[PDB]
Amino acid sequence: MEAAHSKSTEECLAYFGVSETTGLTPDQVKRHLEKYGHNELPAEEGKSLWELVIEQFEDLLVRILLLAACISFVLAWFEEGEETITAFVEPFVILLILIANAIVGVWQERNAENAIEALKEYEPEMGKVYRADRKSVQRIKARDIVPGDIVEVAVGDKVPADIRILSIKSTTLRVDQSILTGESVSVIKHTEPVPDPRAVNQDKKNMLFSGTNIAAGKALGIVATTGVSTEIGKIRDQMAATEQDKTPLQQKLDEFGEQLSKVISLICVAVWLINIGHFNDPVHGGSWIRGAIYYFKIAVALAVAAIPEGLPAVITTCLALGTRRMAKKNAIVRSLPSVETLGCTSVICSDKTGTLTTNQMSVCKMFIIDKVDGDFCSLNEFSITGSTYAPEGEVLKNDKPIRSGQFDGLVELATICALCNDSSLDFNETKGVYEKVGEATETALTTLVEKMNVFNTEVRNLSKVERANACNSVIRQLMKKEFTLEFSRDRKSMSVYCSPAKSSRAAVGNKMFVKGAPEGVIDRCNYVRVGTTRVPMTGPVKEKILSVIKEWGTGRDTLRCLALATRDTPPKREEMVLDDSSRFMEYETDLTFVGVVGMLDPPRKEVMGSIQLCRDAGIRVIMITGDNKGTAIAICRRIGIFGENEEVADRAYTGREFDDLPLAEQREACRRACCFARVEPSHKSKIVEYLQSYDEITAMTGDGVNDAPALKKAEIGIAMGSGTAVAKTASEMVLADDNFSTIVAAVEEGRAIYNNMKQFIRYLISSNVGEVVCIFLTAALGLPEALIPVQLLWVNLVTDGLPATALGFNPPDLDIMDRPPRSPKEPLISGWLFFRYMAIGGYVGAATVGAAAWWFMYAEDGPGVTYHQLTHFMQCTEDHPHFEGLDCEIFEAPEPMTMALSVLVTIEMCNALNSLSENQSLMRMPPWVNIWLLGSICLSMSLHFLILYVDPLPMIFKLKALDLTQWLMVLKISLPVIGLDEILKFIARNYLEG
């Protein structure tokens, strides 16, 4: 099909030869599948094959080093004779460390996307359609939909393909197509054709586009185009871009990155200044131009050696790692930030029905009026069996099976349940079980009437597929549904207008069948039905009705109740304006009470514990629901939000009560109350907002469209896998598994990701500081050069490389989930931390000069012995008195440097073992806890010993192998770094906190 919007409903039906009531024929479906293919887009597998790489080279930090590489390379072509080699290496020593991370990053990034792309591929999308195959609407894989068969869609649904609306089954049909037309607000639809054949999507008010969601109403329509031919299948990634952005934790880490950049840039040009008097030295001999370039090169080298190059990548790796960890737990992270944000979560507002509960409804109790004797009132309670949606169960009166049809009140009760109901039931031949089609609460009523079989219909001689709606169909034949006043949360009810079909009930007139929240309906009832008679509603009757609702509500089964009534004398079909659902409550008045039903909706098993763990991590869990406060509190006690016998008269409200409080008190009640009932979708959001006026990190968990607002308002929205699409769209994460627990685990990961980020910045700084206080302490005490360009670049590639990145793989502390959430305002780096940095950064920098000196001084069997004369080292050229006579060129020996460069590397590797935690002992948290860290160290070490024992290298690096004794001197001066930190930890642990 094409330009389907231009033609009319008949033309479209005509064009495909289909009855909008029957649907395609199994044969037609077979053919169309061949003529149009499956309703699916080309597998958009993990792309960005090369882009990912180039992405690694974007941050400022990596740019700098990437620039230094060019400089070091230009100076290479301008370096002559005897050391051109040691010049062409420097750049590659910078380029390498950079490339080593570009891979770990692009690799982690790859695995992430895949795991996620694989979790989506899991549970296939379904669609509701009408086909000759069956009389009732059936479910099917969305990919099997073909242009032609009749499709049904309702509030909350994801439009499966481009549909030409044929009929609107409600007063209004609003749609959310921002994903296409870009317009945020939900647009209204109609069936009227749009004549302009070249009209824009925003003008086709009689079309529904694949990918958009139904914001309101219900509608039936004919599929115009599917697969790639869809309005959105064309604007696909293959023919349209997308969008990106940087996480908040990253916004704070880039602000910190540059902050370091500036500092580093200063303490570097400072070196170039504190050495202007050396441009004219024998070591250079050449002009001040040749002597400057050297110290200039040392500056850049110190820069590179200081810049935390792996920060921009370690963050990407931790995030990707988080994403991947969630996927392994069946959680789709629609936004990287999510994981981090969930760590600072203090409050988690969760929806009840469908979220904290399973939303597998089943009417197991119900009653109608028996006798009304003035002051005395009796009810006719019943019990129904069968917990699933299967139409297999018995109606019991006093524990004994009875013919529901026997009771008049029960016949009406079923008439209402069947008629004022927008859902249905469909048997899944494959799984061999009846699945619902529509809302569980409504479907529960559908199976109910199937069980009651009030008109004693032959059901034994029927198939699984036919037994599903049989009884229901029968009742649909007795009355004609003129129209329905769709359910709306302000009214808390739904209605349906009916006219008698034949002349059996014709002598009675039109009727309106209502059902909604007990409180609302029972109040708009002036009559209570008794059998087939009617009597006025009285105090005593109202009394009985509610008391039993209360009983069932807060009972052991915490039943979700629904009232049913009828408008014996509805308004004149004309006097009613379906313009706005606000006028409907009036039409549902002067009603006659019929009966009540109670269904069970078991809370999810994993929820109780999750709430406990949430408590341990000092995270609050508030329940928000449209349901009854009684049953709402009941379930709260059942899941652990409330103690079995805890007084909650002050920690539980109903939107009514809440609104009754003055503004200031509402806000206040939000940080006190843990349960809100009979609350509207605007109240959910508001509650979340109040919780945010206290600068807290709020999470929202829901499944319905009445959770859309809240899920958006929150910092992080988590939606149920089996929930509406409209809820998923407004969520940062999706529990495909529907496992509530995963939310907890998502917080731990968020907490660990932050911790690792710290341990990394802690390592890189407490180490790189020594690499500076080593260059200045020497230019202060007067000692000779301790390191050269290539030398620095090397310590960098070995201390700021993989060993640092592997820090992003550090396990969470043994108590990361037993400490309250971190304030969103808490500073990235605490004062005590900066101390930790200078404390270590100072020792390591001094532990290096003390090594270069040690050789010169206390060198036992070590050559070149002397004492304190090092300060005046360029003076043996003219004035060498005390000088024993040892070559006046011993102040340029590789022995000293190579003796320090090793302590440096070595001590830094030791410092890495201190980054396995922040306050935990290296004895409580063994170094072997992060195998990836060890392997990173061993590799780093090996890579160093290699630079010392492979003939060509030691020369290029102006180094000289160390004695099997001099090394022990390093393991002597470096190893103690563990203690300095181990002790500081004991302080922040036992002294400060704890």
Ligand X SMILES: Nc1ncnc2c1ncn2[C@@H]1O[C@H](COP(=O)(O)OP(=O)(O)CP(=O)(O)O)[C@@H](O)[C@H]1O
CA distances from 959 to 927, 947, 951, 954 (A): 30, 8, 10, 5
- 704 touching ligand X, by CB under 6 A: yes
Pick between residue 676 and residue 843 the one whose CB is nearest to ligand X: 676
What is the rounded CA–CA span in Å between residue 176 and residue 186? 5
Q: Which of 351, 369, 23, 335 is nearest to 166 (CA)?
A: 23
Length of the chain: 994
Computed from CA positions of residues 199, 201, 206, 210, in that sequence, does the dihedral angle turn out positive or negative? Answer: positive
Q: Does 721 bind Mg ion (CB under 5 A)?
A: no
640 backbone dihedrals φ, ψ, rounded to 5° = 105, 5
Contact region for ligand X (CB under 6 A) — 70-78, 130-138, 291-299, 350-358? Answer: 350-358
Sheet holding 134-141, edge to edge: 134-141, 126-131, 150-154, 218-225, 162-168, 207-208
Query: Residues touching a second copy: how many (CB under 8 A)?
Result: 9
Tell me which of Ca ion, ligand X, Mg ion, none is bound by residue 492, counting a contact when its beta carbon lies within the kind-specific cut-off of 5 to 8 angstroms: ligand X
**Coil, strand or helix: which one is 461?**
coil
Q: Is residue 581 part of the contact set for ligand X (CB under 6 A)? A: no
d(CA 913, CA 776): 26
Answer for the pair 193, 8: CB distance below 8 angstroms, yes or no: yes
Of the listed pieces 228-236, 399-407, 492-500, 933-941, which binds a second copy according to CB under 8 A?
A: 933-941
Pairs from 639-643 (Cβ < 8 Å, separation ≥ 24):
639/356, 639/603, 639/607, 639/608, 639/611, 640/608, 640/611, 640/612, 641/611, 641/674, 641/675, 642/674, 642/675
Q: Which alpha helices (H) appear in 182-277, and where do they start and end?
A: 231-234, 248-273
Q: How many helices (H) and strands (E) does the chain have?
A: 35, 30
Can residue 412 be called a binding residue for Ca ion (CB under 5 A)?
Answer: no
Q: Which is nearer to ligand X, 584 or 854 (CB)?
A: 584
672 is in an annotated binding site: no
| Position 553 contacts ligand X (CB under 6 A) | no
Q: Shortest Cβ distance from residue 939 to a second copy (Å)?
A: 8
| Contact track, ligand X, 616-645, x by CB under 6 A | ---------xxx------------------
Binding string, residues 72-111; x marks residues near ligand X by CB under 6 A: ----------------------------------------
Cα 45 from Cα 795, distance rounded (Å)? 40
If one asks whether residue 354 binds Mg ion (CB under 5 A), the answer comes out as yes
In this chain, which of 942, 991, 992, 994 binds a second copy, going by CB under 8 A? 942
User: For the residues of 684-750, what is the DSSP string, one character each?
Assistant: HHHHHHHHHTTT--EEEEE-SGGGHHHHHHSSEEEEETTS-HHHHHT-SEEETT--THHHHHHHHHH
CA pair distance 517, 514, nearest whole angstrom: 10
Given the complex with a second copy, which of 70 and 946 has the nearer CB atom?
946
- Residue 460 marked ligand-binding: no
908 annotated among ligand-binding-site residues: yes
If one asks whether residue 799 binds Ca ion (CB under 5 A), the answer comes out as yes
Q: Which of 59, 149, 176, 351 is catalytic?
A: 351
Q: Is 488 a binder of ligand X (CB under 6 A)?
A: no
> Is residue 351 close enough to count as binding ligand X by CB under 6 A?
yes
The token duo for 163 is: 């549909």
State how far the alpha carbon of 130 is from the alpha carbons of 32, 136, 227, in Å: 15, 7, 19
Hey, what amino acid is at 656?
Answer: R
Q: Is position 354 an interface residue for ligand X (rule: CB under 6 A)?
A: yes
Q: Can you name the residues that pair with 149 across neighbouring β-strands?
A: 147
Residue 768 interacts with Ca ion (CB under 5 A): yes or no: yes
Pick one of Mg ion, Ca ion, ligand X, none as the site partner of residue 494 (Cβ within 5 to 8 A by kind).
ligand X
Dihedral angle, C-alpha 537, 540, 544, 545, nearest 10 °: 20
822 known member of a binding site: no
Q: How many CA atoms lie within 13 A of 184 on its CB side?
A: 2
Task: Judge whether 799 is annotated as a binding position.
Answer: yes
Rounded to the nearest 10°, the torsion over CA 745, 750, 751, 754 is 160
Indicate whether 156 belongs to the interface with Mg ion (CB under 5 A).
no
46: left (phi over 0), alpha (psi -120 to 50) or beta: beta
Structural tokens at position 291: 């002597």
Nearest residue (CB) to a second copy, 104 versus 159: 104
Tell me how far apart the alpha carbons of residues 611 and 896 are, in angstroms, rounded to a whole number.
61
Task: State the CB neighbour count (10 A cutoff) for residue 296.
Answer: 18
In the complex, least distance from residue 720 CB atom to Mg ion, rounded to whole angstroms = 8
Q: Which stretch binds a second copy (CB under 8 A): 105-113, 347-355, 632-640, 784-792?
A: 105-113
Select from 105, 337, 438, 704 the one that contacts Mg ion (CB under 5 A): 704
Q: Which of 440, 494, 727, 734 binds ligand X (CB under 6 A)?
A: 494
381 binds Mg ion (CB under 5 A): no
Clarify whether 351 is annotated catalytic: yes
Report how far residue 478's alpha carbon sits from residue 502's, in angstroms, rounded to the nearest whole number. Answer: 7
Three-state SS sequence of 139-181: EEEHHHCCECEEEEEECCCECCCEEEEEEECCCCCEEECHHHH
Pick the binder of Mg ion from 90, 113, 152, 351 (CB under 5 A): 351
Q: Of these partners, Ca ion, ligand X, a second copy, none, which one is at the site of residue 796 (CB under 5 to 8 Å by kind)?
A: Ca ion
* Contact call for residue 111 and a second copy (CB under 8 A): yes
Torsion of CA 568, 572, 574, 580, to 10 degrees: -40
Stretch of 352-360, 446-454, 812-820, 917-925 lying at the interface with Mg ion (CB under 5 A)? 352-360
Q: Give the residue, chosen from 353, 698, 805, 966, that forms a contact with Mg ion under the rule CB under 5 A.
A: 353
Stretch of residues binding ligand X (CB under 6 A), selected from 347-355, 570-578, 751-759, 889-897: 347-355
HSE-up (13 A, CA, CB side) for residue 801: 27
Q: Helix, strand or coil for residue 759?
A: helix
CB of residue 936 to a second copy, shortest distance in Å: 11
| Nearest distance, CB of residue 538 and ligand X, angstroms | 24
| Number of chain positions touching ligand X (CB under 6 A) | 21
800 binds Ca ion (CB under 5 A): yes
Stretch in the footprint of Ca ion (CB under 5 A) among 29-37, 302-310, 507-515, 554-562: 302-310
Q: Are 417 and 454 in contact (CB under 8 A)?
A: no
Q: Which does 952 bind (CB under 5 to 8 A by kind): Mg ion, Ca ion, a second copy, none?
A: a second copy
Please tell me whether residue 517 binds ligand X under the rule CB under 6 A: yes
Of these, 216, 302, 425, 562, which contacts ligand X (CB under 6 A)?
562
DSSP 452: H
Query: How many whole angstroms separate alpha carbon 759 and alpha carbon 351?
Result: 37
625 labeled part of a ligand binding site: yes
Is residue 305 part of an annotated ligand binding site? yes
Work out whether 952 is an interface residue with a second copy (CB under 8 A). yes
Which residue is nearest to ligand X, using beta carbons? 626
Strand partners, 527: 536, 592
Q: The tokens of 51 are what?
A: 């882009």
898 binds Ca ion (CB under 5 A): no
**Quick check: 56 binds ligand X (CB under 6 A)?**
no
Q: Does 81 bind a second copy (CB under 8 A)?
A: no
- Residue 86 interface partner, choices Mg ion, Ca ion, a second copy, none, CB cut-off 5-8 Å depending on type: none
Q: Which residues are catalytic?
A: 351
| Binding footprint of ligand X on the chain (CB under 6 A) | 351-354, 439, 441-442, 487, 489, 492-494, 515-517, 562, 625-627, 704, 706
Q: Which residues belong to the annotated binding site for ATP?
A: 353, 442, 489, 515, 560, 625-627, 678, 684, 706
| Binding footprint of Ca ion on the chain (CB under 5 A) | 307, 767-768, 796, 799-800
| Binding footprint of a second copy on the chain (CB under 8 A) | 107, 110-111, 935, 938-939, 942, 951-952
Q: Which residues belong to the annotated binding site for Ca(2+)?
A: 304-305, 307, 309, 768, 771, 796, 799-800, 908
Q: Which residues belong to the annotated binding site?
A: 304-305, 307, 309, 351, 353, 442, 489, 515, 560, 625-627, 678, 684, 703, 706, 768, 771, 796, 799-800, 908
